[PDB]
């Protein structure tokens, strides 16, 4: 990771953005006031 240079082994995948998007879509705040 970033707080852990030790990261999960991978050669072609997608991990962080995946859960990121899961939580994002979960928000349902179609007008999410944010960044």
């Amino acid at each position: 990771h970033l707080p852990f240079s030790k990261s999960e082994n991978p050669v072609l995948s997608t991990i962080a953005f995946l859960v990121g998007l899961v939580n994002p879509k979960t928000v349902q705040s179609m007008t999410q006031r944010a960044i």
Binding site: E8, S13, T14, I15, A16, L18, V19, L21, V22
Partner: peptide
């Protein structure tokens, strides 16, 4: 009709005491 592939809706409800999961969320990590 179909596309060999299933999907999820957005109008169902919750017992609020479930015991089922599914790899449609990608918590990979």
């Amino acid at each position: 009709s179909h596309s060999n592939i299933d999907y999820q809706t957005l109008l169902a409800n919750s017992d609020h005491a479930k015991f089922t999961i599914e790899p449609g969320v990608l918590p990979v990590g």
